[PDB]
C-alpha cells in the first residue's frame, strides 16, 4: 500500500553518497550513522550495528540501504496500525483488552472463534497475569 516515492529514493541516494568517502558505493557503520542523522533521525551504536547486519565486512551498498529504509517504512506503518487497532479492540477505552472485547471485535472482522480459543489467545498474550491484555502485551502479540 504505502511505498517509497521517487522523491524520497532520490533524497536517500544523495544522503548516502554525501557521506561515502570512496567512490565504491559502500558505506560503513560509522558512515551509516551520519547518513541517518542527515535524514532527521538519531540511532545508537547497537541500532546501527543491527541495521547493517540485517542487510549484510560491516558495509552496505545503496540497494541494501534502500531495502533497510523500506523496511523502516513498513514497520512504522505497522506500528501505528497496531496502535489504531488497540483503540478499536479496547471497546470501553479502559486501556485493557478483555476476552469479551476480543471476541466481539473478531466477530466483526469475519473471525468466528470458540470461547475457548479466545481464552487461549488472551492467556497466551497475558504476561503480567492481570487477566486482560494491555498495549504492551498487545504489541508483542501482534508483532510475533
Amino acid at each position: 500500500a504505502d511505498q517509497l516515492t521517487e522523491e524520497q529514493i532520490a533524497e536517500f541516494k544523495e544522503a548516502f553518497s554525501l557521506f561515502d568517502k570512496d567512490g565504491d558505493g559502500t558505506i560503513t557503520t560509522k558512515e551509516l550513522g551520519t547518513v541517518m542523522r542527515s535524514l532527521g533521525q538519531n540511532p545508537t551504536e547497537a541500532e546501527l550495528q543491527d541495521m547493517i547486519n540485517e542487510v549484510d565486512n560491516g558495509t552496505i551498498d545503496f540497494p541494501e540501504f534502500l531495502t533497510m529504509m523500506a523496511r523502516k517504512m513498513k514497520d512504522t506503518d505497522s506500528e501505528e496500525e497496531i496502535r489504531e487497532a488497540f483503540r478499536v479492540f479496547d471497546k470501553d477505552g479502559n486501556g485493557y483488552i478483555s476476552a469479551a472485547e476480543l471476541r466481539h471485535v473478531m466477530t466483526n472482522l469475519g473471525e468466528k472463534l470458540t470461547d475457548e480459543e479466545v481464552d487461549e489467545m488472551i492467556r497466551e498474550a497475558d504476561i503480567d497475569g492481570d487477566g486482560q491484555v494491555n498495549y504492551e502485551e498487545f504489541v508483542q502479540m501482534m508483532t510475533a
Partner: peptide
C-alpha cells in the same frame, strides 16, 4: 457483513491461527 481489512494489515496476520 464483516469488515474488509487490507492484506498488509497486522490484524489479518493475527487471523493466521
Amino acid at each position: 457483513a464483516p469488515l474488509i481489512l487490507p492484506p498488509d494489515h497486522p490484524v489479518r496476520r493475527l487471523f493466521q491461527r
